Amino acid sequence: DPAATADTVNPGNKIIYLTFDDGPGKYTQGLLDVLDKYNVKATFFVTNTHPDYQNMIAEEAKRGHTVAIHSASHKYNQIYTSEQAFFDDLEQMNSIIKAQTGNDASIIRFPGGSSNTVSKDYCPGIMTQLVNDVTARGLLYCDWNVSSGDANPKPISTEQVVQNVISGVQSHNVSVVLQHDIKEFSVNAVEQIIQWGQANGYTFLPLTTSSPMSHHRVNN
Ligand SMILES: [Mg+2]
Ligand SMILES: [Zn+2]
């Protein structure tokens, strides 16, 4: 029930929240350098899939970005077998974020989105329970309303990612863009996306606890 949660703060008009899933990884440092070049803050929904880059979580926070939870294991067949397994994994990821940044996470992004149906193969009904359990735990969750197309099993070109994000943003006064910073071709699109947005009156912001969240329909 939306009635039970605090109002969010209107962020203004022509807003873009660039967000990045599945990292950190080998391309994250380069992405941080690009964001610094344009003085833009973003949001990272992190995993422990590539623990050789775990210190990038500390760097993301140090540089002013929002560090949020995606999943420690990012294994659907583990985290979606029970509420208990999901939160064991979520807590492991939060603990790494605390170790690295000094702070707990406040925001999460469910693997597959809150709208995913892959979780039906492991626990029917679990997403309906988890959106309520995450809320009861004082956590916020965010899906997205602009696809970059960078999740396709066959990669698209950097130029196609640029065009996908620029065209999707124009559909929304307030956009939450999904990219994955573990994909080199998609990271390499971010510079042109920022150039275009800044030249067209858009403001890039990081997600915070007072931001409006983007929520999909829950399908499981
Ligand atoms: Mg329960
Ligand atoms: Zn993911």
PDB file of C-alpha atoms and ligand atoms in Angstrom:
ATOM      1  CA  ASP A   1       0.000   0.000   0.000  1.00  0.00           C
ATOM      2  CA  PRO A   2       1.641   3.266  -1.187  1.00  0.00           C
ATOM      3  CA  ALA A   3      -0.270   5.083   1.573  1.00  0.00           C
ATOM      4  CA  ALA A   4       2.094   3.627   4.199  1.00  0.00           C
ATOM      5  CA  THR A   5       5.271   5.152   2.847  1.00  0.00           C
ATOM      6  CA  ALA A   6       6.776   8.648   2.969  1.00  0.00           C
ATOM      7  CA  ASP A   7       6.322  11.081   0.117  1.00  0.00           C
ATOM      8  CA  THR A   8       9.228  11.491  -2.226  1.00  0.00           C
ATOM      9  CA  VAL A   9      10.689  14.823  -3.270  1.00  0.00           C
ATOM     10  CA  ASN A  10      10.004  16.034  -6.786  1.00  0.00           C
ATOM     11  CA  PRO A  11      13.454  16.219  -8.533  1.00  0.00           C
ATOM     12  CA  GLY A  12      12.384  18.710 -11.203  1.00  0.00           C
ATOM     13  CA  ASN A  13      11.976  18.267 -14.913  1.00  0.00           C
ATOM     14  CA  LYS A  14      13.980  16.482 -17.650  1.00  0.00           C
ATOM     15  CA  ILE A  15      15.784  14.260 -15.139  1.00  0.00           C
ATOM     16  CA  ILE A  16      17.992  11.262 -15.983  1.00  0.00           C
ATOM     17  CA  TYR A  17      19.149   8.747 -13.408  1.00  0.00           C
ATOM     18  CA  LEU A  18      21.901   6.720 -15.091  1.00  0.00           C
ATOM     19  CA  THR A  19      22.093   3.350 -13.329  1.00  0.00           C
ATOM     20  CA  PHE A  20      24.486   0.437 -13.733  1.00  0.00           C
ATOM     21  CA  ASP A  21      23.899  -3.228 -12.803  1.00  0.00           C
ATOM     22  CA  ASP A  22      26.051  -6.251 -12.242  1.00  0.00           C
ATOM     23  CA  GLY A  23      29.437  -4.618 -11.525  1.00  0.00           C
ATOM     24  CA  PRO A  24      31.926  -3.751 -10.368  1.00  0.00           C
ATOM     25  CA  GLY A  25      34.185  -5.232 -13.030  1.00  0.00           C
ATOM     26  CA  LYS A  26      37.141  -4.386 -15.274  1.00  0.00           C
ATOM     27  CA  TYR A  27      35.397  -1.502 -17.068  1.00  0.00           C
ATOM     28  CA  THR A  28      34.084   0.269 -13.976  1.00  0.00           C
ATOM     29  CA  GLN A  29      37.160   2.418 -13.316  1.00  0.00           C
ATOM     30  CA  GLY A  30      37.007   3.797 -16.875  1.00  0.00           C
ATOM     31  CA  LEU A  31      33.284   4.544 -16.409  1.00  0.00           C
ATOM     32  CA  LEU A  32      34.053   6.431 -13.166  1.00  0.00           C
ATOM     33  CA  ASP A  33      36.612   8.521 -15.074  1.00  0.00           C
ATOM     34  CA  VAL A  34      34.005   9.417 -17.719  1.00  0.00           C
ATOM     35  CA  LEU A  35      31.437  10.373 -15.068  1.00  0.00           C
ATOM     36  CA  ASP A  36      34.086  12.573 -13.418  1.00  0.00           C
ATOM     37  CA  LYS A  37      34.934  14.165 -16.759  1.00  0.00           C
ATOM     38  CA  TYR A  38      31.323  15.434 -17.036  1.00  0.00           C
ATOM     39  CA  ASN A  39      30.826  15.920 -13.279  1.00  0.00           C
ATOM     40  CA  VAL A  40      27.844  13.509 -13.226  1.00  0.00           C
ATOM     41  CA  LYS A  41      26.763  11.204 -10.390  1.00  0.00           C
ATOM     42  CA  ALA A  42      25.133   7.843 -11.083  1.00  0.00           C
ATOM     43  CA  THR A  43      23.797   4.842  -9.234  1.00  0.00           C
ATOM     44  CA  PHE A  44      25.509   1.434  -9.054  1.00  0.00           C
ATOM     45  CA  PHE A  45      23.517  -1.693  -8.263  1.00  0.00           C
ATOM     46  CA  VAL A  46      26.388  -3.956  -7.276  1.00  0.00           C
ATOM     47  CA  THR A  47      27.233  -7.655  -7.033  1.00  0.00           C
ATOM     48  CA  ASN A  48      30.135  -9.731  -5.844  1.00  0.00           C
ATOM     49  CA  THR A  49      30.433 -11.565  -9.166  1.00  0.00           C
ATOM     50  CA  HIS A  50      33.914 -10.136  -9.818  1.00  0.00           C
ATOM     51  CA  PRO A  51      35.579  -9.894  -6.423  1.00  0.00           C
ATOM     52  CA  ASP A  52      38.886  -8.834  -8.133  1.00  0.00           C
ATOM     53  CA  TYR A  53      37.203  -5.391  -8.495  1.00  0.00           C
ATOM     54  CA  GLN A  54      35.508  -5.204  -5.098  1.00  0.00           C
ATOM     55  CA  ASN A  55      37.446  -2.063  -4.083  1.00  0.00           C
ATOM     56  CA  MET A  56      35.614  -0.201  -6.864  1.00  0.00           C
ATOM     57  CA  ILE A  57      32.611  -0.145  -4.548  1.00  0.00           C
ATOM     58  CA  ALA A  58      34.656   2.038  -2.179  1.00  0.00           C
ATOM     59  CA  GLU A  59      35.667   4.230  -5.136  1.00  0.00           C
ATOM     60  CA  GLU A  60      32.065   4.601  -6.347  1.00  0.00           C
ATOM     61  CA  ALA A  61      30.993   5.924  -2.966  1.00  0.00           C
ATOM     62  CA  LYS A  62      34.104   8.092  -2.533  1.00  0.00           C
ATOM     63  CA  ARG A  63      33.387   9.795  -5.847  1.00  0.00           C
ATOM     64  CA  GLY A  64      29.849  10.664  -4.821  1.00  0.00           C
ATOM     65  CA  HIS A  65      27.816   7.957  -6.580  1.00  0.00           C
ATOM     66  CA  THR A  66      24.995   6.005  -4.991  1.00  0.00           C
ATOM     67  CA  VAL A  67      25.968   2.460  -4.086  1.00  0.00           C
ATOM     68  CA  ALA A  68      22.953   0.154  -3.986  1.00  0.00           C
ATOM     69  CA  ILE A  69      22.378  -3.623  -3.764  1.00  0.00           C
ATOM     70  CA  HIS A  70      21.780  -5.924  -6.754  1.00  0.00           C
ATOM     71  CA  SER A  71      22.868  -9.314  -5.400  1.00  0.00           C
ATOM     72  CA  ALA A  72      25.985 -10.883  -3.936  1.00  0.00           C
ATOM     73  CA  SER A  73      25.808 -14.047  -6.025  1.00  0.00           C
ATOM     74  CA  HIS A  74      23.495 -12.895  -8.813  1.00  0.00           C
ATOM     75  CA  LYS A  75      22.391 -16.520  -9.080  1.00  0.00           C
ATOM     76  CA  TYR A  76      18.648 -16.633  -9.726  1.00  0.00           C
ATOM     77  CA  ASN A  77      18.480 -20.316  -8.819  1.00  0.00           C
ATOM     78  CA  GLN A  78      19.900 -19.572  -5.387  1.00  0.00           C
ATOM     79  CA  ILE A  79      18.442 -16.265  -4.337  1.00  0.00           C
ATOM     80  CA  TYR A  80      14.880 -16.926  -5.461  1.00  0.00           C
ATOM     81  CA  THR A  81      14.378 -20.349  -3.847  1.00  0.00           C
ATOM     82  CA  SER A  82      12.993 -18.794  -0.602  1.00  0.00           C
ATOM     83  CA  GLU A  83      12.583 -15.423   1.148  1.00  0.00           C
ATOM     84  CA  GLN A  84      15.299 -16.561   3.558  1.00  0.00           C
ATOM     85  CA  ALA A  85      17.785 -17.300   0.740  1.00  0.00           C
ATOM     86  CA  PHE A  86      17.051 -13.951  -0.895  1.00  0.00           C
ATOM     87  CA  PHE A  87      17.754 -11.987   2.268  1.00  0.00           C
ATOM     88  CA  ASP A  88      20.822 -14.054   3.144  1.00  0.00           C
ATOM     89  CA  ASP A  89      22.230 -12.985  -0.211  1.00  0.00           C
ATOM     90  CA  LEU A  90      21.021  -9.374   0.099  1.00  0.00           C
ATOM     91  CA  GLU A  91      22.642  -9.123   3.541  1.00  0.00           C
ATOM     92  CA  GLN A  92      25.935 -10.544   2.282  1.00  0.00           C
ATOM     93  CA  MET A  93      26.008  -7.829  -0.367  1.00  0.00           C
ATOM     94  CA  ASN A  94      25.083  -5.127   2.143  1.00  0.00           C
ATOM     95  CA  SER A  95      27.908  -6.291   4.402  1.00  0.00           C
ATOM     96  CA  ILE A  96      30.436  -5.888   1.590  1.00  0.00           C
ATOM     97  CA  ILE A  97      29.068  -2.417   0.882  1.00  0.00           C
ATOM     98  CA  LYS A  98      29.434  -1.535   4.577  1.00  0.00           C
ATOM     99  CA  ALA A  99      33.012  -2.926   4.660  1.00  0.00           C
ATOM    100  CA  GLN A 100      33.946  -0.924   1.572  1.00  0.00           C
ATOM    101  CA  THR A 101      32.063   2.365   2.101  1.00  0.00           C
ATOM    102  CA  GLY A 102      31.396   2.564   5.822  1.00  0.00           C
ATOM    103  CA  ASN A 103      27.643   2.720   5.245  1.00  0.00           C
ATOM    104  CA  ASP A 104      24.736   0.342   4.729  1.00  0.00           C
ATOM    105  CA  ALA A 105      22.822   0.391   1.472  1.00  0.00           C
ATOM    106  CA  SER A 106      19.362   1.978   1.342  1.00  0.00           C
ATOM    107  CA  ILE A 107      18.204   1.032  -2.166  1.00  0.00           C
ATOM    108  CA  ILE A 108      18.139  -2.259  -4.052  1.00  0.00           C
ATOM    109  CA  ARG A 109      17.338  -3.522  -7.535  1.00  0.00           C
ATOM    110  CA  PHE A 110      15.946  -7.024  -7.757  1.00  0.00           C
ATOM    111  CA  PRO A 111      17.779  -9.273 -10.218  1.00  0.00           C
ATOM    112  CA  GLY A 112      15.561  -9.444 -13.305  1.00  0.00           C
ATOM    113  CA  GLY A 113      13.598  -6.429 -11.985  1.00  0.00           C
ATOM    114  CA  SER A 114      10.709  -6.659  -9.478  1.00  0.00           C
ATOM    115  CA  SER A 115       8.732  -7.721 -12.581  1.00  0.00           C
ATOM    116  CA  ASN A 116      10.788 -10.851 -13.271  1.00  0.00           C
ATOM    117  CA  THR A 117       9.117 -14.214 -13.838  1.00  0.00           C
ATOM    118  CA  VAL A 118      12.239 -16.367 -13.717  1.00  0.00           C
ATOM    119  CA  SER A 119      11.690 -16.482  -9.944  1.00  0.00           C
ATOM    120  CA  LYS A 120       8.500 -18.545 -10.695  1.00  0.00           C
ATOM    121  CA  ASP A 121      10.764 -21.441 -11.605  1.00  0.00           C
ATOM    122  CA  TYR A 122      12.190 -21.420  -8.083  1.00  0.00           C
ATOM    123  CA  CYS A 123       9.444 -20.134  -5.770  1.00  0.00           C
ATOM    124  CA  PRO A 124       5.993 -19.176  -7.088  1.00  0.00           C
ATOM    125  CA  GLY A 125       4.766 -16.011  -5.368  1.00  0.00           C
ATOM    126  CA  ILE A 126       8.142 -14.943  -4.021  1.00  0.00           C
ATOM    127  CA  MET A 127       8.228 -11.501  -5.637  1.00  0.00           C
ATOM    128  CA  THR A 128       4.862 -10.523  -4.177  1.00  0.00           C
ATOM    129  CA  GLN A 129       6.294 -11.439  -0.775  1.00  0.00           C
ATOM    130  CA  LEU A 130       9.668  -9.806  -1.334  1.00  0.00           C
ATOM    131  CA  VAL A 131       8.418  -6.338  -2.403  1.00  0.00           C
ATOM    132  CA  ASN A 132       6.558  -6.337   0.885  1.00  0.00           C
ATOM    133  CA  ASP A 133       9.479  -7.758   2.919  1.00  0.00           C
ATOM    134  CA  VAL A 134      12.003  -5.301   1.458  1.00  0.00           C
ATOM    135  CA  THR A 135       9.649  -2.431   2.329  1.00  0.00           C
ATOM    136  CA  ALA A 136       9.148  -3.755   5.892  1.00  0.00           C
ATOM    137  CA  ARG A 137      12.942  -3.775   6.238  1.00  0.00           C
ATOM    138  CA  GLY A 138      13.073  -0.067   5.395  1.00  0.00           C
ATOM    139  CA  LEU A 139      14.640  -0.639   2.010  1.00  0.00           C
ATOM    140  CA  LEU A 140      13.697   1.069  -1.278  1.00  0.00           C
ATOM    141  CA  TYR A 141      13.789  -0.717  -4.606  1.00  0.00           C
ATOM    142  CA  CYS A 142      14.016   0.659  -8.134  1.00  0.00           C
ATOM    143  CA  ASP A 143      13.317  -0.846 -11.548  1.00  0.00           C
ATOM    144  CA  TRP A 144      13.752   1.314 -14.699  1.00  0.00           C
ATOM    145  CA  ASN A 145      11.801   3.016 -17.483  1.00  0.00           C
ATOM    146  CA  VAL A 146      14.509   3.383 -20.194  1.00  0.00           C
ATOM    147  CA  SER A 147      16.096   0.291 -21.714  1.00  0.00           C
ATOM    148  CA  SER A 148      19.552   0.579 -23.190  1.00  0.00           C
ATOM    149  CA  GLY A 149      19.209  -2.749 -24.989  1.00  0.00           C
ATOM    150  CA  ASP A 150      22.548  -3.827 -23.488  1.00  0.00           C
ATOM    151  CA  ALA A 151      21.167  -6.944 -21.781  1.00  0.00           C
ATOM    152  CA  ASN A 152      20.585  -8.857 -25.046  1.00  0.00           C
ATOM    153  CA  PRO A 153      22.429 -12.218 -25.287  1.00  0.00           C
ATOM    154  CA  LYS A 154      23.858 -10.944 -28.589  1.00  0.00           C
ATOM    155  CA  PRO A 155      25.491  -7.560 -27.863  1.00  0.00           C
ATOM    156  CA  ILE A 156      24.456  -4.471 -29.822  1.00  0.00           C
ATOM    157  CA  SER A 157      26.841  -1.732 -30.846  1.00  0.00           C
ATOM    158  CA  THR A 158      27.917   1.187 -28.747  1.00  0.00           C
ATOM    159  CA  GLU A 159      26.132   3.469 -31.193  1.00  0.00           C
ATOM    160  CA  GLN A 160      22.936   1.458 -30.808  1.00  0.00           C
ATOM    161  CA  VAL A 161      23.120   1.821 -26.993  1.00  0.00           C
ATOM    162  CA  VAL A 162      23.516   5.571 -27.430  1.00  0.00           C
ATOM    163  CA  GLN A 163      20.447   5.762 -29.696  1.00  0.00           C
ATOM    164  CA  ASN A 164      18.382   3.487 -27.431  1.00  0.00           C
ATOM    165  CA  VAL A 165      18.995   5.568 -24.324  1.00  0.00           C
ATOM    166  CA  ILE A 166      18.505   8.942 -26.049  1.00  0.00           C
ATOM    167  CA  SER A 167      15.274   7.849 -27.675  1.00  0.00           C
ATOM    168  CA  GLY A 168      13.944   6.195 -24.477  1.00  0.00           C
ATOM    169  CA  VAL A 169      14.658   9.234 -22.262  1.00  0.00           C
ATOM    170  CA  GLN A 170      12.511  11.429 -24.470  1.00  0.00           C
ATOM    171  CA  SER A 171       9.468   9.410 -23.459  1.00  0.00           C
ATOM    172  CA  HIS A 172       9.736  10.452 -19.812  1.00  0.00           C
ATOM    173  CA  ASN A 173      10.043  13.610 -17.803  1.00  0.00           C
ATOM    174  CA  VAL A 174      11.952  11.563 -15.262  1.00  0.00           C
ATOM    175  CA  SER A 175      14.002   8.645 -16.621  1.00  0.00           C
ATOM    176  CA  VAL A 176      15.760   5.757 -14.881  1.00  0.00           C
ATOM    177  CA  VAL A 177      18.120   4.186 -17.440  1.00  0.00           C
ATOM    178  CA  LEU A 178      19.271   0.575 -17.126  1.00  0.00           C
ATOM    179  CA  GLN A 179      22.811  -0.197 -18.268  1.00  0.00           C
ATOM    180  CA  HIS A 180      25.349  -2.776 -17.134  1.00  0.00           C
ATOM    181  CA  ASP A 181      28.859  -1.572 -16.351  1.00  0.00           C
ATOM    182  CA  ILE A 182      30.247  -5.076 -16.963  1.00  0.00           C
ATOM    183  CA  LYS A 183      29.603  -4.544 -20.683  1.00  0.00           C
ATOM    184  CA  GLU A 184      32.393  -2.626 -22.357  1.00  0.00           C
ATOM    185  CA  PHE A 185      30.288  -1.551 -25.388  1.00  0.00           C
ATOM    186  CA  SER A 186      27.649  -0.082 -23.099  1.00  0.00           C
ATOM    187  CA  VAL A 187      30.113   1.717 -20.822  1.00  0.00           C
ATOM    188  CA  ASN A 188      31.584   3.252 -23.955  1.00  0.00           C
ATOM    189  CA  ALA A 189      28.184   4.778 -24.781  1.00  0.00           C
ATOM    190  CA  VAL A 190      27.933   6.819 -21.594  1.00  0.00           C
ATOM    191  CA  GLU A 191      29.991   9.790 -22.795  1.00  0.00           C
ATOM    192  CA  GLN A 192      27.764  10.492 -25.826  1.00  0.00           C
ATOM    193  CA  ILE A 193      24.636   9.919 -23.714  1.00  0.00           C
ATOM    194  CA  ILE A 194      25.801  12.588 -21.236  1.00  0.00           C
ATOM    195  CA  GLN A 195      26.837  14.985 -24.016  1.00  0.00           C
ATOM    196  CA  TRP A 196      23.416  14.672 -25.616  1.00  0.00           C
ATOM    197  CA  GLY A 197      21.483  14.957 -22.373  1.00  0.00           C
ATOM    198  CA  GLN A 198      23.389  17.980 -21.144  1.00  0.00           C
ATOM    199  CA  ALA A 199      23.038  19.687 -24.543  1.00  0.00           C
ATOM    200  CA  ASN A 200      19.261  19.086 -24.506  1.00  0.00           C
ATOM    201  CA  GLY A 201      18.351  20.486 -21.070  1.00  0.00           C
ATOM    202  CA  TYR A 202      18.490  17.246 -19.104  1.00  0.00           C
ATOM    203  CA  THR A 203      19.955  16.973 -15.576  1.00  0.00           C
ATOM    204  CA  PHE A 204      21.777  13.786 -14.502  1.00  0.00           C
ATOM    205  CA  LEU A 205      21.212  12.819 -10.904  1.00  0.00           C
ATOM    206  CA  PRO A 206      22.047   9.909  -8.544  1.00  0.00           C
ATOM    207  CA  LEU A 207      19.189   8.064  -6.814  1.00  0.00           C
ATOM    208  CA  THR A 208      18.704   8.938  -3.165  1.00  0.00           C
ATOM    209  CA  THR A 209      16.212   7.924  -0.517  1.00  0.00           C
ATOM    210  CA  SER A 210      14.067  10.959  -1.328  1.00  0.00           C
ATOM    211  CA  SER A 211      14.023  10.238  -5.103  1.00  0.00           C
ATOM    212  CA  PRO A 212      10.873   8.957  -6.754  1.00  0.00           C
ATOM    213  CA  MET A 213      11.384   5.225  -7.447  1.00  0.00           C
ATOM    214  CA  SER A 214      10.507   3.563 -10.733  1.00  0.00           C
ATOM    215  CA  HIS A 215       8.361   0.470  -9.994  1.00  0.00           C
ATOM    216  CA  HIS A 216       7.218  -2.124 -12.476  1.00  0.00           C
ATOM    217  CA  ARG A 217       4.207  -4.420 -12.100  1.00  0.00           C
ATOM    218  CA  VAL A 218       4.962  -7.489  -9.988  1.00  0.00           C
ATOM    219  CA  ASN A 219       4.325 -10.640 -12.059  1.00  0.00           C
ATOM    220  CA  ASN A 220       5.235 -13.378  -9.575  1.00  0.00           C
TER     221      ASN A 220
HETATM  222 MG    MG B   1       7.047 -13.895   4.715  1.00  0.00          MG
HETATM  223 ZN    ZN B   2      21.664  -8.173 -13.066  1.00  0.00          ZN
END
